[PDB]
Amino acid sequence: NQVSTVTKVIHHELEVAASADDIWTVYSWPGLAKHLPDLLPGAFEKLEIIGDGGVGTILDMTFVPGEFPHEYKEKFILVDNEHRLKKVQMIEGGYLDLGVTYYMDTIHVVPTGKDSCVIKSSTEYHVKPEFVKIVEPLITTGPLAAMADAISKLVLEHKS
């Protein structure tokens, strides 16, 4: 037969003193992609956007030297305004070159009051069992936390 692939999930939250709608509005903004290096000081050696920024857009990203991974492409695969849920898939390169067969980020912006919310970020991946110990330490909440940190700051400042 084949040995089962292994599934791993990691999770990150950031509480934010702004409406779920204000935060959701930036995460789902088709204009965000182009602005990513404005939101992340460096990190990008290169960023090519294929598509209009909306769902179906492919981002091809090269990272400054050292940074693992160095290169990968990501695709915006779902926007759900009713749930404030967005999904972004890693589609080529990156961890897919280290025995990972599926890598999906989900962001869910959840109201905590009239004027507060929590950004729930998760990554789910499927990995060949002999590669689990290799990738386990490489795949972290770092990138989701960095996205939530930048968007949180942008929105709180746009309204202070």
- Which amino acids are annotated catalytic? 86
Contact of 74 with 58, CB cutoff 8 Å:
yes
| Helix, strand, coil shares, percent, the chain, to 5 | 30, 45, 30
Interaction between residue 43 and ligand KCZ (CB under 6 A): yes
* Choice between 16 and 88, CB closer to ligand KCZ: 88
User: Which residue type does 90 have?
Assistant: M
* Choice between 96 and 128, CB closer to ligand KCZ: 96
Give the 3-state secondary structure of residue 139: coil
* Choice between 93 and 143, CB closer to ligand KCZ: 143
Interaction between residue 120 and ligand KCZ (CB under 6 A): no
CA distance 20 to 84: 8
CA distance 118 to 91: 27
Number of residues that bind ligand KCZ (CB under 6 A): 13
Interaction between residue 72 and ligand KCZ (CB under 6 A): no
Kindly give the pairing relationship between strand 85-93 and strand 71-80: antiparallel
Binding to ligand KCZ (CB under 6 A) within 3-42 occurs at 27, 32-33, 40
Query: Which chain residues interact with ligand KCZ by CB under 6 A?
Result: 27, 32-33, 40, 43, 61, 74, 86, 88, 107, 143, 146-147
